[PDB]
Short mmCIF file of C-alpha atoms in Angstrom, two decimals:
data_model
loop_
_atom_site.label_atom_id
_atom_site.label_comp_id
_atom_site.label_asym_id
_atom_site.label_seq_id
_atom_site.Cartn_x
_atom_site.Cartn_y
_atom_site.Cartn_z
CA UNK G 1 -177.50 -44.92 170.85
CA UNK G 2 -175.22 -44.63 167.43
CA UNK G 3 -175.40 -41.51 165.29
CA UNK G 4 -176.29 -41.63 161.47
CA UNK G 5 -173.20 -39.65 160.49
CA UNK G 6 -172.18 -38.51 156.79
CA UNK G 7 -169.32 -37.98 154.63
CA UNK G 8 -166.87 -35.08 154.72
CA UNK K 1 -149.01 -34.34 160.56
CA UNK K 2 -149.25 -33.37 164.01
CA UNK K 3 -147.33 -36.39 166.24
CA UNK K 4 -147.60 -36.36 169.69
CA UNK K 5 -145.23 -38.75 171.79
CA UNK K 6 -146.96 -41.14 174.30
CA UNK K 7 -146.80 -40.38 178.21
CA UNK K 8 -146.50 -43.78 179.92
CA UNK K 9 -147.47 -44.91 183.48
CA UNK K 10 -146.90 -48.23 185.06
CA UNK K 11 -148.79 -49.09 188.29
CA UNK K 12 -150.95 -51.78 189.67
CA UNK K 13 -154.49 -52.06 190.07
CA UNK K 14 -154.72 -52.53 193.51
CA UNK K 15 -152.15 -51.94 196.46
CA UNK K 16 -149.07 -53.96 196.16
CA UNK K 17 -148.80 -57.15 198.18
CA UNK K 18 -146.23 -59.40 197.87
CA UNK K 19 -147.76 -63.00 196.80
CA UNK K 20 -151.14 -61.18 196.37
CA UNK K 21 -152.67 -61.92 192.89
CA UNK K 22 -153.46 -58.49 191.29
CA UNK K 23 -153.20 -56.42 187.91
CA UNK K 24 -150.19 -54.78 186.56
CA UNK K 25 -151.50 -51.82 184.00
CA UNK K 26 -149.42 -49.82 181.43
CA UNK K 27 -151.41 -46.75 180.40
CA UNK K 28 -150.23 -44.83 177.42
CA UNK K 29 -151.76 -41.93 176.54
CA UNK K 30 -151.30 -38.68 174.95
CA UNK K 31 -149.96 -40.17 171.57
CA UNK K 32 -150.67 -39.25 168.04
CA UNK K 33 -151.19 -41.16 165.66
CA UNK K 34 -153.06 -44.12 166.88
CA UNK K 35 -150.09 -47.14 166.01
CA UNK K 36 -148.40 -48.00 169.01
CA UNK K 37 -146.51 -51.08 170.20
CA UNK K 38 -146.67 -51.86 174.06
CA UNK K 39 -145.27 -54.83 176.04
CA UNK K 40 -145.44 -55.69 179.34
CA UNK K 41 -141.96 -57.10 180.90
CA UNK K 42 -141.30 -59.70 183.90
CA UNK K 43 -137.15 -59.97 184.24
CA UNK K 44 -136.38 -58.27 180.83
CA UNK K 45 -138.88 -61.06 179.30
CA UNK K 46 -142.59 -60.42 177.32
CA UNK K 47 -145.43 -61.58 178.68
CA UNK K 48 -148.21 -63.44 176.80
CA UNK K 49 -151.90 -62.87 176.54
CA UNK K 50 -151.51 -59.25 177.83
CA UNK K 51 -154.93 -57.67 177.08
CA UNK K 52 -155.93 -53.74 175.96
CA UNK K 53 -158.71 -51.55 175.96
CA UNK K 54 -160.40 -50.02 172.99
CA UNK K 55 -158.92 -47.36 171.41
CA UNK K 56 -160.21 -44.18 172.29
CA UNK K 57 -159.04 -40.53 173.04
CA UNK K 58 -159.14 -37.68 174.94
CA UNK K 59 -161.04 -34.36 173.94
CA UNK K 60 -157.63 -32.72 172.53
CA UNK K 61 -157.89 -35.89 170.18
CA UNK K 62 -154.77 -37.64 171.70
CA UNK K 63 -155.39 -41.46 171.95
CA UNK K 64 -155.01 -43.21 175.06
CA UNK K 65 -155.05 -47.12 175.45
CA UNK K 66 -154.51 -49.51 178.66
CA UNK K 67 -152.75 -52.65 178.60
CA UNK K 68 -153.09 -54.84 181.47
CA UNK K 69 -152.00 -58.63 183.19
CA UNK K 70 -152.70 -60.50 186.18
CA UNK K 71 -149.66 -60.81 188.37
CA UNK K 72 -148.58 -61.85 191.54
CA UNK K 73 -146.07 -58.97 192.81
CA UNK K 74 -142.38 -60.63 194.89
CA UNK K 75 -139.74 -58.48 196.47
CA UNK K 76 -137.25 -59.67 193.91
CA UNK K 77 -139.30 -59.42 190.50
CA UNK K 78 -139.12 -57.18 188.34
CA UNK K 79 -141.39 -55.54 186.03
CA UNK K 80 -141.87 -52.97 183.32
CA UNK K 81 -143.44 -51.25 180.07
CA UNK K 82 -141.85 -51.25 176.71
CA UNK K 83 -143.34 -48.70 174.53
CA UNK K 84 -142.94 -47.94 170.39
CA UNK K 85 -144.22 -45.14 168.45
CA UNK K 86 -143.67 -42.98 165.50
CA UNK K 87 -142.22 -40.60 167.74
CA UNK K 88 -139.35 -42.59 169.75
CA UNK K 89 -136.56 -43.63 167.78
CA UNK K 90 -135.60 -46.31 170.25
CA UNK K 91 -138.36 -48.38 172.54
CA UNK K 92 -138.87 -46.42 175.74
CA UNK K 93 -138.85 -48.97 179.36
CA UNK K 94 -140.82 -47.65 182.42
CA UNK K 95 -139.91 -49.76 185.19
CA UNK K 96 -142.83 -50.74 187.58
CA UNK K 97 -142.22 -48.60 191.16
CA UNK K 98 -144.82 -49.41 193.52
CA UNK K 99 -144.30 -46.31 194.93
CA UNK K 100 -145.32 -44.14 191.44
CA UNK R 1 -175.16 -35.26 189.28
CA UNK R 2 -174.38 -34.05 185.54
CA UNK R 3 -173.88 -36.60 183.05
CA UNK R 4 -172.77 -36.90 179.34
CA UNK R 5 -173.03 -39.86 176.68
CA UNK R 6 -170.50 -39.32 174.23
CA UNK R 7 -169.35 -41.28 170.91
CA UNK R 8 -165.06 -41.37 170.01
CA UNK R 9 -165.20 -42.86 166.51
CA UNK R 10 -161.68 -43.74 164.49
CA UNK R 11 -161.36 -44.15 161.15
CA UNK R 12 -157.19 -45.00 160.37
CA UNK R 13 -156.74 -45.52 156.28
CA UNK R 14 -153.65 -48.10 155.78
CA UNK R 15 -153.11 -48.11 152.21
CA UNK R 16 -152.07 -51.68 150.92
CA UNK R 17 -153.32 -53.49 154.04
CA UNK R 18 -157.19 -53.33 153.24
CA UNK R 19 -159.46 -50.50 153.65
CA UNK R 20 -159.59 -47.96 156.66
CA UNK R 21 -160.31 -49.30 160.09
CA UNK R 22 -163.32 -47.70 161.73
CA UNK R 23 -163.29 -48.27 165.67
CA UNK R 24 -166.40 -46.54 167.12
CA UNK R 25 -166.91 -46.31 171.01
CA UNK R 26 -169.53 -45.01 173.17
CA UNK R 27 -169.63 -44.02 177.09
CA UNK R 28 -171.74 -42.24 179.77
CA UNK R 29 -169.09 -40.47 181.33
CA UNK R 30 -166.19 -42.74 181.82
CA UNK R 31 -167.80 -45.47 181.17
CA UNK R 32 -167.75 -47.80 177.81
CA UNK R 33 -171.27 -49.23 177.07
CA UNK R 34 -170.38 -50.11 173.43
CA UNK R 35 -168.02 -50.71 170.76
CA UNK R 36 -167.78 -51.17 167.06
CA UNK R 37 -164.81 -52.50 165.70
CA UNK R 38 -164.31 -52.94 161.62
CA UNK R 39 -161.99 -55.35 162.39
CA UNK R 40 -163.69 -57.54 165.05
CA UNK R 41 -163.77 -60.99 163.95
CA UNK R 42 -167.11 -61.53 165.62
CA UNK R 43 -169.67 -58.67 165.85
CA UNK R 44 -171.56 -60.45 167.63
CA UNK R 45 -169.05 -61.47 170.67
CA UNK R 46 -168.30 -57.26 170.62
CA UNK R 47 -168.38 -55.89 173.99
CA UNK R 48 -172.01 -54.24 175.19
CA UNK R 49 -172.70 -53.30 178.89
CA UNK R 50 -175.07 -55.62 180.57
CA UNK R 51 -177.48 -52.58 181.07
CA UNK R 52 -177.46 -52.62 177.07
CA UNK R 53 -178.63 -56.01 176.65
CA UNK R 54 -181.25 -55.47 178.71
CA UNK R 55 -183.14 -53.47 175.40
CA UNK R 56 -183.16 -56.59 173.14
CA UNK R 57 -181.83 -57.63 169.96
CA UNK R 58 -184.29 -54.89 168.02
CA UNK R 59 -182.04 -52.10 169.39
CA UNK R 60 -178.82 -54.50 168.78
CA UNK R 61 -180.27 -54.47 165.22
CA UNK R 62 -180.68 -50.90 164.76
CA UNK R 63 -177.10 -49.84 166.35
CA UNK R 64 -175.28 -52.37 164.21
CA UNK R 65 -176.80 -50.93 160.73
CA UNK R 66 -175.44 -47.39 161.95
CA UNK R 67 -172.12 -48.52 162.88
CA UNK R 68 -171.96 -50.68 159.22
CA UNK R 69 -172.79 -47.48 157.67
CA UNK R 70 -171.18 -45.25 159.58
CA UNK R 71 -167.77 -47.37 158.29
CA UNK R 72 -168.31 -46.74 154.87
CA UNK R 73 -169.15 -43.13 155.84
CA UNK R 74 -166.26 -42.64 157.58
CA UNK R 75 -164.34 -44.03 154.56
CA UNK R 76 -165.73 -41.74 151.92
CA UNK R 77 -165.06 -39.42 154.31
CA UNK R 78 -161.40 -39.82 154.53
CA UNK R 79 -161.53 -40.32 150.45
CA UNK R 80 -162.54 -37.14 150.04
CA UNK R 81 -160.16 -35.60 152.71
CA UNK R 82 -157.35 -36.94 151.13
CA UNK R 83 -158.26 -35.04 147.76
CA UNK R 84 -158.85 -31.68 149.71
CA UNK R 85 -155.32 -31.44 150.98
CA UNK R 86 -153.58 -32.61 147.75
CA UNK R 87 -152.60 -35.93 149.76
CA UNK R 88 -150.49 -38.80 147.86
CA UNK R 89 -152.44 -42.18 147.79
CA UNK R 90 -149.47 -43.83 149.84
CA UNK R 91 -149.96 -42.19 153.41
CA UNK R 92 -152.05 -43.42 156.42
CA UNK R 93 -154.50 -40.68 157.50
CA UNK R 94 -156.90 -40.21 160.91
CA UNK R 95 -160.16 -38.88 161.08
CA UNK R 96 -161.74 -38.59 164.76
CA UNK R 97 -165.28 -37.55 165.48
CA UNK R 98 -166.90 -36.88 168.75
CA UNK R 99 -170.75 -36.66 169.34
CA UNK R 100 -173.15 -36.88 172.12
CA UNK R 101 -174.93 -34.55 174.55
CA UNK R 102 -174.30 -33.10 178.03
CA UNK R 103 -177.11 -33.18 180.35
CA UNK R 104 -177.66 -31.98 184.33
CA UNK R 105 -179.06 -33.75 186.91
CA UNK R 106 -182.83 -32.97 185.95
CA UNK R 107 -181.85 -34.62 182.85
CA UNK R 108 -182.36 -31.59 180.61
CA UNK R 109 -180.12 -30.89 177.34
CA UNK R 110 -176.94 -28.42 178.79
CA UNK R 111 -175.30 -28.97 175.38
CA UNK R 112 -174.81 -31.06 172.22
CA UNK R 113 -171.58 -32.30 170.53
CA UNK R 114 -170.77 -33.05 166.74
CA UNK R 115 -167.66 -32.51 165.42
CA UNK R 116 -164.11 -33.64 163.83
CA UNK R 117 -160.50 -33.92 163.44
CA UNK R 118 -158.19 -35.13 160.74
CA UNK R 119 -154.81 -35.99 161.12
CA UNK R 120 -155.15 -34.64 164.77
CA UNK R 121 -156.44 -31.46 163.47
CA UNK R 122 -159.87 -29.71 164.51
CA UNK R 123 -161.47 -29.79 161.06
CA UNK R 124 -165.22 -28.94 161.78
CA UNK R 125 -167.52 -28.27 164.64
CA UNK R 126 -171.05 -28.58 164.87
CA UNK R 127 -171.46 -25.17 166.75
CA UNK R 128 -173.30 -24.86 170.35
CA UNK R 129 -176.48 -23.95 168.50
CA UNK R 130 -177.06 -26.98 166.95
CA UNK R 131 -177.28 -24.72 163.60
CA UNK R 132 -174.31 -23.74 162.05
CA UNK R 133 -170.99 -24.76 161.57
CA UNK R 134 -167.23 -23.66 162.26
CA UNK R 135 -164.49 -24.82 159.50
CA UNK R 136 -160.88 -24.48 160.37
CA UNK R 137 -160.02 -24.26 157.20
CA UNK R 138 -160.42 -23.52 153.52
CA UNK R 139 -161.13 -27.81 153.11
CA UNK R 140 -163.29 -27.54 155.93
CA UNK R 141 -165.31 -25.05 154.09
CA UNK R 142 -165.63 -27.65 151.53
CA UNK R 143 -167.62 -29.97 154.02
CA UNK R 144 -169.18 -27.09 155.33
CA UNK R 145 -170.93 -26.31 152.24
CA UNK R 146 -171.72 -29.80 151.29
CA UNK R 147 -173.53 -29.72 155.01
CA UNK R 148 -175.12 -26.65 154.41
CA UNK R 149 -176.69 -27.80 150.91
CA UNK R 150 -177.77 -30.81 152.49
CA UNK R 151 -179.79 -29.21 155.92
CA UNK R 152 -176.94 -32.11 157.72
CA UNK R 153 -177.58 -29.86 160.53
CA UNK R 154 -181.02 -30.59 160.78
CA UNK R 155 -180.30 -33.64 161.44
CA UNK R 156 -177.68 -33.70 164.09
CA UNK R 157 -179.77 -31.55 165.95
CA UNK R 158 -183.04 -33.92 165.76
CA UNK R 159 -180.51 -36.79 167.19
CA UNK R 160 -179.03 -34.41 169.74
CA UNK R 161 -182.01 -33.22 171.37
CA UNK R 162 -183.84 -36.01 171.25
CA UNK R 163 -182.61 -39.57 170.54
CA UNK R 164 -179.13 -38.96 172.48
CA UNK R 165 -180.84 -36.96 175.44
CA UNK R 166 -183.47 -40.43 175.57
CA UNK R 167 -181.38 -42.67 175.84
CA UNK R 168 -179.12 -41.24 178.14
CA UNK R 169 -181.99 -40.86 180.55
CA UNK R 170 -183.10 -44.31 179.87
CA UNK R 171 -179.41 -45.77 180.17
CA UNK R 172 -178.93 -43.40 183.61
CA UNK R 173 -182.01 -45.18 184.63
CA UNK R 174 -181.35 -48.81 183.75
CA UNK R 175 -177.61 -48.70 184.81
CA UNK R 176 -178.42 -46.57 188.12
CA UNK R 177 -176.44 -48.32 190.80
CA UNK R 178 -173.33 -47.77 188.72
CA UNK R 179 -174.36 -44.98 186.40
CA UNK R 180 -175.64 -42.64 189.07
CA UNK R 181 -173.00 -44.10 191.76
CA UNK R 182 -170.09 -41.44 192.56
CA UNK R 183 -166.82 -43.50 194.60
CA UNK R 184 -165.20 -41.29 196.23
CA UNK R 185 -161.26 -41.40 196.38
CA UNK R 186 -158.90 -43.49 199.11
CA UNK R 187 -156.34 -40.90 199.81
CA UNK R 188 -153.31 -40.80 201.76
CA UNK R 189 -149.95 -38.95 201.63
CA UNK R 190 -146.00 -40.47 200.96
CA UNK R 191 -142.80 -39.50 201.73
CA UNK R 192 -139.98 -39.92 199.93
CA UNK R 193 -136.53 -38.85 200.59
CA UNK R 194 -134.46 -37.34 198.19
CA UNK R 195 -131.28 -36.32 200.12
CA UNK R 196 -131.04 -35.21 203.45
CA UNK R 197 -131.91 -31.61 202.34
CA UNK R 198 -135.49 -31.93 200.57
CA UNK R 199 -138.08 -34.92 200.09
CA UNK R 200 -141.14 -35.70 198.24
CA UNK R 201 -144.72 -35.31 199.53
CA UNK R 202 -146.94 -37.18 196.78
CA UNK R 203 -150.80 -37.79 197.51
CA UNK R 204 -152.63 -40.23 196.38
CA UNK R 205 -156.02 -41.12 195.06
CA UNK R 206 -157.45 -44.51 194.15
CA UNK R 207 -160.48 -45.74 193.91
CA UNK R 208 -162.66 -43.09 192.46
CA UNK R 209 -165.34 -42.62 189.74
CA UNK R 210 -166.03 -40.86 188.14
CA UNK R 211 -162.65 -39.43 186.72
CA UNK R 212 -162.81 -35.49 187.37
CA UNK R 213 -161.19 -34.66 190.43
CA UNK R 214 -159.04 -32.12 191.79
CA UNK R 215 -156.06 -32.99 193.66
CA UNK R 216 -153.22 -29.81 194.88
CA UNK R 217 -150.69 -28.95 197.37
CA UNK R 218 -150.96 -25.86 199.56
CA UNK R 219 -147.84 -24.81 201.32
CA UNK R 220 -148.92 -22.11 203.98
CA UNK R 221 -152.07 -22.10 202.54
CA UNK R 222 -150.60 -20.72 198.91
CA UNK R 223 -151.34 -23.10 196.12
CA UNK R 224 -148.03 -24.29 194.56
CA UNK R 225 -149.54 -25.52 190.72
CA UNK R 226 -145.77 -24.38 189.50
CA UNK R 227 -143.92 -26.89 191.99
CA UNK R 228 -146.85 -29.83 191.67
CA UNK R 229 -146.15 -32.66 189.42
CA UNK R 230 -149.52 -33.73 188.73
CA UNK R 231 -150.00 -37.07 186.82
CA UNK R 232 -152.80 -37.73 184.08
CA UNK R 233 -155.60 -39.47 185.79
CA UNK R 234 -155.63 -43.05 184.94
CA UNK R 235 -157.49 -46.35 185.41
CA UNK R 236 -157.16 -49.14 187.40
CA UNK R 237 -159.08 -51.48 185.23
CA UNK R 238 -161.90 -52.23 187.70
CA UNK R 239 -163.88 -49.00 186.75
CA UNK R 240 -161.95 -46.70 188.91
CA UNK R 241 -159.12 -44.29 188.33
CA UNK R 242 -156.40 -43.21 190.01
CA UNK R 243 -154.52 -39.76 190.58
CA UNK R 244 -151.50 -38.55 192.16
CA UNK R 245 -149.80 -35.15 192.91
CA UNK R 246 -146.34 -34.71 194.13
CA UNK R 247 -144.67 -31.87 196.11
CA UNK R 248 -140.43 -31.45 196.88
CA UNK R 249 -139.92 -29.77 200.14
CA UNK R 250 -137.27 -28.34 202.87
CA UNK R 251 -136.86 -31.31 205.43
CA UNK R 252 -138.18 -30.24 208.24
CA UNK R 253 -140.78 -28.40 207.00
CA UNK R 254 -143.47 -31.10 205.79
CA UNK R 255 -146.23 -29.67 208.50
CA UNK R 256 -146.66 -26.77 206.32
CA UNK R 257 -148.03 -28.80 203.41
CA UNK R 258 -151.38 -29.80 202.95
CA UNK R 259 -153.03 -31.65 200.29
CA UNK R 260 -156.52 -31.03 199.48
CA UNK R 261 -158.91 -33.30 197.07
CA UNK R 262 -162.49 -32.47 195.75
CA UNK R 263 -164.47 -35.66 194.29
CA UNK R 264 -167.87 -35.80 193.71
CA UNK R 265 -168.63 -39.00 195.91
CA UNK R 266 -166.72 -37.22 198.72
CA UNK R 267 -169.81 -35.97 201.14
CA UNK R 268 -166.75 -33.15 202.01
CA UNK R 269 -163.49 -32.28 200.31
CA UNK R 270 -160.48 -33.54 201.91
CA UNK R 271 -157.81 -31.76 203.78
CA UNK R 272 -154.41 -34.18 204.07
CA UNK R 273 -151.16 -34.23 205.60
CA UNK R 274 -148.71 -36.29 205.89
CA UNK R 275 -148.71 -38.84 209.26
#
């Protein structure tokens, strides 16, 4: 199951 | 950036038998950055329709990628991987061994 | 045994030929079960294992709006990287991510993963603790704060512990016979001549999932990792991988040589000579 990532 | 030159190996999937249908595989890995040209040979010549894997990598970041055919081995073909990258200035050919 | 579900996501910019690729692909151990390509032509024709489908088109749903925004994500990321290294406008730049948990054979949380490299360089970590953070650098420390500000942390953690560990349970579960199945490797040794002085000893191991395995040469019962030419592990394209490691020796003298292979489908580890 895909992770909610966020920006950098 | 960092570049890291490709490691080639050329093998089949399954045991070699001559006239046996089978897979011949050309795994390149250890490379970075991700562009990289592969072709599989038969007598000098490309083949068509050869197939990859996603691209993925290794836990020291260093992509890795397998491309792959169906062929049926002879004693008197002749087969190999043709490999591009940032990092070769000419295309390096890894001859098919099936003893390697 | 242990397992481990782990995302490798690539984001590749390629100024004046459309906006950065972002590949994202997921495994339990070695393994694919998924992939996200920005480039895919049809979404919907993308790979999924068949032990995926099995959830429905509610947890298709779900995955696909993370991947979408985990594209544009990935390209604000690399934006914004770009500025904190002074970087022209004209250059192709990488940023890697790995994520995903490590659990035993109970299925409780060993460890949880988060973190990133840009042009092949560890940039951050999520640290073991699931808290705080380790920059490499001073444009790390950049994103670090940002994270910080935010409680980003938080967040990874709540996926880490929970949703991750889940669904690798429930994946382990629904994918058992392959998931949960160790193959243990087909070994046997060569010989190879070299000249009438010395030949080649290489042993051999196909077959075998997962990947980790250890394959040496003893000579006299004295490990010889200097003289061993080890190859990377590799697949064969039907789920299994392959190994070899090789060995030059005195003619003559091949009896002393022995070849020995752990594998976690192997009920014993293997002693081998050759004939």
């Amino acid at each position: 199951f895909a992770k909610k990532k966020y920006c950098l | 950036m960092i570049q890291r030159t490709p490691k080639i190996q050329v093998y089949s999937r399954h045991p070699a038998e001559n006239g046996k249908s089978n897979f011949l595989n050309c795994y390149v890995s250890g490379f970075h950055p991700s562009d990289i040209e592969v072709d599989l040979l038969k007598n000098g010549e490309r083949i068509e329709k050869v197939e990859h894997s996603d691209l993925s990598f290794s836990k020291d970041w260093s992509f890795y990628l397998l491309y792959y055919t169906e062929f049926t081995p002879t004693e008197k073909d002749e087969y190999a991987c043709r490999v591009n990258h940032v990092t070769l200035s000419q295309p390096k050919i890894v001859k098919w061994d099936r003893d390697m | 045994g242990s397992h481990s579900m782990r995302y490798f996501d690539t984001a590749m910019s390629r100024p004046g030929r459309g906006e950065p690729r972002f590949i994202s692909v997921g495994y339990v151990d070695d393994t694919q079960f998924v992939r996200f390509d920005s480039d895919a032509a049809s979404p919907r024709e993308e790979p999924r294992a068949p032990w995926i489908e099995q959830e429905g088109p509610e947890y298709w749903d779900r995955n696909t709006q993370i991947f979408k925004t985990n594209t544009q994500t990935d390209r604000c990321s690399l934006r914004n990287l770009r500025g904190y290294y002074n970087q022209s406008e004209a250059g192709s730049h990488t940023l890697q991510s790995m994520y995903g948990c490590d659990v035993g054979p109970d299925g409780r949380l060993l460890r949880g993963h988060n973190q990133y490299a840009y042009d092949g360089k560890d940039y951050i970590a999520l640290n073991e603790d699931l808290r705080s953070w380790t920059a490499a650098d001073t444009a790390a420390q950049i994103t670090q704060r940002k994270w910080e500000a935010a409680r980003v942390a938080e967040q990874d953690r709540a996926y880490l512990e929970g949703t991750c560990v889940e669904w690798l349970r429930r994946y382990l579960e629904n994918g058992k016979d392959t998931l949960e199945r160790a193959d243990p490797p087909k070994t046997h040794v060569t010989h190879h001549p070299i000249s009438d002085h010395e030949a080649t000893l290489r042993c051999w191991a196909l077959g075998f999932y997962p990947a980790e395995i250890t394959l040496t040469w003893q000579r006299d019962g004295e490990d010889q990792t200097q003289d061993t030419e080890l190859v990377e592990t590799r697949p064969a394209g039907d789920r299994t991988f392959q190994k070899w490691a090789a060995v030059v020796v005195p003619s003559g003298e091949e009896q002393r040589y022995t070849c020995h292979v752990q594998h976690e489908g192997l009920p014993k580890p293997l002693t081998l000579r050759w004939e």
